[PDB]
Design a protein around this ligand. Structure first.
Ligand SMILES: NC(=O)C1=CN([C@@H]2O[C@H](COP(=O)(O)OP(=O)(O)OC[C@H]3O[C@@H](n4cnc5c(N)ncnc54)[C@H](O)[C@@H]3O)[C@@H](O)[C@H]2O)C=CC1
Ligand SMILES: NC(=O)C1=CN([C@@H]2O[C@H](COP(=O)(O)OP(=O)(O)OC[C@H]3O[C@@H](n4cnc5c(N)ncnc54)[C@H](O)[C@@H]3O)[C@@H](O)[C@H]2O)C=CC1
Ligand code: NA
Ligand code: NA
Ligand code: NA
Ligand code: NA
Ligand code: NA
Ligand code: NA
Lengths: 751, 751
């Protein structure tokens, strides 16, 4: 006997045709479109396609309510707590409504979706309580536009709304056009929880309403959804000064070693088949099994797949629900029709909007199905021989979200996990989620983290704003020839290199004295720099202690030439350079200090074990330095970057390049390994787009302008970007460490 | 061919008879006693027995230099870095000198002692660099008296001096009377490193000079050495307001599971036989082997023990050196002569001050040798059947310092480790040490941590001092009888209990109105409370989420009665109680916030893997609340304690008990599990000594005075203590979380 939907149908009947939740109240229904129960084919309700006028109104209500909301964090905590209690009281109503709207088994909605949504609000209440005293240097961003997909409607809403509200922001959120209902119910309890009017605003519609939110007068955009829409959002927000987080999916690898717990590994994969749909952090879809056990593993997998029960999602004895929508069904069918590799195995499926669990095995690692996105309850599988080959196959995609590793051996599991490119790695489990544990992607899975103390950074700004210094025009001079040899080069791969293009410009002091010449880098020089950083990948695997020693040497050797550097700064700018040199020395010693002291966080979780929120290097970073602070700007950016294990290519000050070129000898005398620090001089108009575009860079920092061009071009590979503000005279070290690292969360057994 | 000591003998000849290093200079030699090379029997040098006048002078020089030293953390970093570089340049001299003085193999001094000492100074330089910006609410303590033992002379010095100096303190340190030389050489390089005069002071002598330092005008005492001297130091410093850390030894268990790597486990134990001497964090001496592999394991152990090379410690091909002193030799011989259990196996030993590696096997878990201290290169062994039995045998001593666990299984290793009572647990290794990883004991192994960010807390105070409110005398009244029933009880084990002694006192308001009666607890009531906390041990194993929910309930149910509580406060004190109630609610919501958010730290280390610096509950805590703040004082102390997993017994305000007694119903309505919170009322003169004495409490917090009595009585079981200052009107939550937790560092494979 399946579960009753009487209460949910009753709420739907009460609410009628839906408008939006704006400014604390329901607007009149507008231009209506149906949401349909995918299991019965019946219309559940009519919802509105928001107009531009609605989106403007919702953003204006969020703006009007935000400052009083931000003022009192203890009062925000009470509201988030009340929202969690209402989610718990109305648990059954939320679960049934999710199943009706989305098609998922009532048992998943009741045991997974709604419990985790409650926990997210319970847990984040406390961040609001603690923000004033524990994050005193942080402040709200303001208004957050939020857009989410159809696979986990309530949970995806909680992941967006709870940390935004906790940190004193207000929200305009649009659920997916296929799954609006539980967000509309969440709106309908906001009054009861004490949510002040206009702090939460829910508008419904398709991607066109999403586009209006993304380009609206908001301080933040947070998106979960497809990679392609992610790219367009990165482009539409380029140069606007908005904060941006993107969770873009990518279904992750499930590594099963020769000594894994076979039965638990099979069961974990089966229990994940229905869960692994849409753009969710998850593992299971790319099955990588050591060749010695692959046949036995696949044989058990097919049999356990046969035990999965398909049908009525309101039946708590059902494991496979209805596909979310006929279009999604057809996408799955088309994917299978488009594949010609492997051996397809399918359980039977009943009539209607159902698709059966499917295993496509016998793929070679190079097969497109191993690298393309996967849709539906579909598994693809390949084998490996050695753990190093498993790492290689797992990291050989454009994605990087979550991974799973199964081994009973204490070493193998803990040595494989950090080598996989992901924001999350589960050891002897999969799809483990907790509000205290950050989750999010690298590569084309996007950027940003949700959950934990770590997730709060994306919903705050520094309490005291800094301001990038204005550009400075290079000094001019008469143009007589230099009888002495004073033409600086570039610094690439541990040695000085002529610019590929052969050109250099004269550098003149404040009164037109010719000081020397500096090279003009081009794209071929940058590409040589990137190859030099690729050869220096070992630097990302060194100890913190080794990197500290290096930075101490750089600091020492700068001190030995401190007078020379100050006079070079004075020659170029006319201002005394001693204070800038003393501060550049200091920034090095601060970075040396930090190199072995930026700790990962151990999270307690209600599940098995603990979540280890590790810090990791971003990788290779291209950096454009400001005109001002010829030496301080370069060193302040370079030093925390390499302290944390990154390799960097810096475009030195365009107005005043000769301090950076004098620094070459400092790097050589300090034994900076080749490729760890590369330095380009010349016109930033020539380099900004190439550095932001480059497909083999993991981050671009543009602190000399060109923010729009840089942020737009970063969409090519969805690299992280930072375009300031950056004030060299301000010690940004601690914040730069955050720009220079990624969080990877490793879930391990414990206690 | 053994190593040359020409350079070390030359330095010894240059320095002559030794005075002390005081105020930046060497004092005249005084009352001389010899330090003797234990391998040759030859006198190495004469050193001075410091007088009281010397100790006064050294402390006065440390005091005179400290404030200018504390002012500039970047300059302190340069000095610590220079000290590390000098340790590295003179590495060979330090190593040889350590071997000459102590007897240890030159290979250990050169590969372990001196490298780790360098690393400690390199690593801690950075804390000095970062202190101003990253610990802005913290300030130096001032002058530190430091006393250390003979087993690792240079390394023990580095563990004391480097964090003290980094945090802006100055030091007076006394090495052990048997091993002064490398501390005197460390003194001899301080000038070259830029150590300003009087920032480091080294005085030599026996325990009588240690006694003078401990009771001198210093702000901190830090001791490593025997449990008995630790107790006397806790007593001599009782009531003085001095900070205190004690590292008291206890040789730790080495758990070898049925599925361990047998050969690596045996080798790790053999390579640890010589290392595990004196009061050092170490594991190996108590061998616990699963019964299925015990015979094969012991057979391999005896054979590998035979391969250990004994002789000339200046020979780099030697594993077993000379015993540190003839008295230590005799202590070992007496221990073996005193034992009658087990089967003793011994390798041969050569003539002189040598003792051979010894295995005493076949002990039952109850044998004294399994629980007493062990001396020399001696191993004792017993077997177990199940992992739970291994946990039981390992935790069945008065000690709790370090432990080792060997298993190839990913779960078993990570599930056994947190169950062992220790400050350190090594998985598939032993005696792993790093400057970033905290180490220190629980139980009779002492208290405090050395190393890492965590170790800095013991060398700092809050930058802004707070002040405990003055005592308040209970109001008096005429003494007419109460025709109504208004006699409050105690709250013990989840239910209200009459005081064992049967007595209660009348409570009068400011004008002599009889408000009711409050019970007078005695030692039998406290003992009932402790048994109630023992039955509530499960609370220490709950999730952070469960504990948060409980605290939220307490906060909610206090809010429901907020007017009643404010009027009760007003009845007792004559002052309006609304603000105290609102703040008591807030403290609960802050603690609820923190319950699932106080994260452990993941340390990068130059060795295999990572060090997980976990937070853990202290356990059972007895708390004495101040007179002032009848409700705020109790709640502010109770709530962070139970947020972190502790069970508590609080002695409520002596002047104003009736708010705490009204709180009983709040605990019952909030479903606080029985024994988690117990409340005693009555005279703190009756309870202070019993709570500080009690052998089954892990900590005592005395915030109502009696500091001397409490701190002295805490020496019985060497429980942690805190005697303030505590100002209820100040939000101490974050600092109380530190009082309410212990750090356990778990070293695990990784990458
Ligand atoms: N049978 C087939 O071949 C089907 C193809 N698709 C296609 O998949 C693509 C995206 O897949 P979905 O699962 O729908 O994820 P999505 O990325 O389109 O949706 C995630 C969220 O983004 C919103 N959104 C969509 N476009 C946006 C934009 N330009 N700006 C801002 N927000 C926007 C959506 O309304 C939704 O709430 C589309 O090209 C769609 O046509 C999906 C299903 C059927
Ligand atoms: N053959 C035997 O039976 C021997 C017995 N022992 C005994 O062991 C006990 C302590 O063992 P040790 O290894 O020497 O460690 P310890 O705890 O005595 O020494 C650690 C450090 O504490 C200093 N110290 C000693 N007493 C002190 C005090 N009252 N106040 C402050 N500092 C003090 C010491 O001088 C040393 O630098 C003593 O009772 C000693 O007589 C040690 C060796 C030989
Ligand atoms: Na629907
Ligand atoms: Na990315
Ligand atoms: Na857990
Ligand atoms: Na000696
Ligand atoms: Na203790
Ligand atoms: Na390591």
């Amino acid at each position: 006997a399946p579960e009753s939907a009487k209460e949910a149908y009753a709420w739907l009947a009460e609410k009628g045709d839906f408008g939006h939740f704006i400014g604390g109240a329901w607007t009149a229904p507008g231009d209506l479109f149906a949401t349909v129960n995918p299991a019965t084919g019946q219309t559940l309700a009519q919802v509105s396609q928001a107009t531009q006028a609605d989106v403007d109104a919702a953003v204006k209500a969020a703006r009007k309510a935000q400052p009083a909301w931000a003022k009192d964090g203890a009062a925000r905590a009470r509201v988030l707590y009340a929202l969690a209690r209402l989610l718990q009281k109305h648990a059954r109503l939320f679960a049934v409504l999710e199943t009706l709207d989305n098609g998922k088994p009532i048992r998943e909605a009741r045991d997974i979706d709604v419990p985790l949504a409650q926990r997210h609000f319970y847990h984040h209440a406390g961040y609001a309580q603690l923000m004033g005293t524990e994050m005193p240097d942080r402040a709200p961003l303001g208004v957050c536009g939020q857009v989410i997909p159809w696979n986990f409607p309530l949970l995806m809403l909680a992941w967006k709304i709870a940390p935004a509200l906790a940190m004193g922001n207000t929200v305009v959120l649009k659920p997916a056009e296929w799954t609006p209902l539980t967000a509309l119910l969440f709106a309908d309890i906001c009054g009861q929880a004490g949510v002040p009017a206009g702090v939460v605003n829910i508008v419904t519609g398709d991607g066109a309403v999403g586009e209006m939110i993304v380009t609206a007068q908001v301080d933040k955009v947070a998106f979960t959804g497809s990679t392609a829409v992610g790219r367009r959002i990165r482009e539409a927000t380029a140069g606007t000064g908005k904060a941006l987080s993107l969770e873009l999916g990518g279904k992750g690898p499930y590594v099963v070693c020769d000594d894994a717990d076979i039965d638990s590994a099979v069961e974990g994969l089966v229990d994940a088949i229905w869960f692994n749909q849409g753009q969710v952090c998850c593992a299971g879809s790319r099955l990588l099994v050591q060749e010695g056990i692959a046949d036995v593993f696949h044989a058990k997998l097919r049999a356990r797949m046969d035990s999965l029960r398909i049908g009525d999602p309101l039946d708590k004895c059902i494991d496979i629900g209805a596909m979310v929508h006929p279009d999604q069904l057809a996408r799955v069918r088309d994917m299978v029709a488009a594949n010609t590799d492997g051996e397809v195995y399918q359980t039977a499926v009943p009539a209607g909007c159902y698709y059966p669990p499917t295993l496509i095995s016998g793929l070679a690692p190079a097969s497109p199905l191993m690298q393309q996105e996967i849709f539906g309850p579909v598994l693809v599988s390949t084998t490996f021989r050695t753990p190093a080959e498993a790492v290689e196959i797992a990291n050989n995609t454009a994605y990087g979200l979550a991974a799973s590793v199964w081994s009973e051996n204490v070493n193998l599991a803990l040595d494989l996990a950090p080598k996989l490119v992901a924001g999350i790695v589960w050891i002897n489990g999969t799809n483990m989620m907790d509000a205290a544990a950050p989750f999010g992607g690298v590569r084309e899975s996007g950027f940003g983290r949700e959950g934990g103390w770590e997730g709060l950074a994306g919903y705050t700004r520094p309490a005291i704003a800094t301001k990038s210094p204005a550009a400075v025009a290079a000094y001019t001079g008469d143009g007589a020839a230099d009888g002495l040899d004073r033409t600086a080069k570039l610094y690439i791969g541990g040695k000085q290199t002529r610019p590929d293009g052969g050109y250099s410009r004269a550098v003149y002091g404040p009164k037109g004295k010719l000081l020397g010449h500096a090279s003009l880098s081009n794209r071929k020089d940058l590409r040589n720099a990137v190859e030099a950083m690729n050869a220096a990948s070992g630097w990302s695997r060194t100890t913190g202690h080794l990197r500290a020693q290096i930075l101490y040497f750089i600091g020492e050797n700068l001190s030995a030439r401190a007078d020379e550097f100050a006079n070079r700064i004075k020659d170029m700018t006319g201002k005394d350079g001693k204070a800038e040199v003393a501060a550049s020395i200091d920034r090095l010693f601060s970075a040396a200090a930090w190199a072995d002291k930026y700790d990962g966080q151990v999270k307690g979780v209600p599940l098995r074990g603990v979540a280890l929120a590790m810090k990791e290097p971003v990788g290779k970073i291209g950096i454009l330095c400001p005109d001002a602070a010829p030496l301080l700007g370069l060193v302040s950016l370079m030093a925390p970057a390499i302290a944390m294990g990154n390799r960097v290519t810096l475009a030195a000050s365009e107005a005043f390049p000769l301090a950076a070129t004098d620094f070459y000898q400092v790097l050589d005398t300090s034994d900076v390994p080749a490729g760890v620090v590369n330095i380009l001089t010349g016109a930033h108009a020539d380099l900004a787009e190439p550095m932001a575009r480059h497909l083999d860079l993991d981050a671009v920092w543009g602190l000399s302008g060109h923010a729009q061009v840089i942020e737009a071009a970063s969409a090519g590979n969805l690299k992280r970007s930072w375009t300031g503000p950056f004030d060299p005279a301000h010690d940004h070290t601690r914040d730069i460490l955050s720009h220079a690292t990624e969080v990877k969360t490793i879930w391990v057994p414990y206690g």
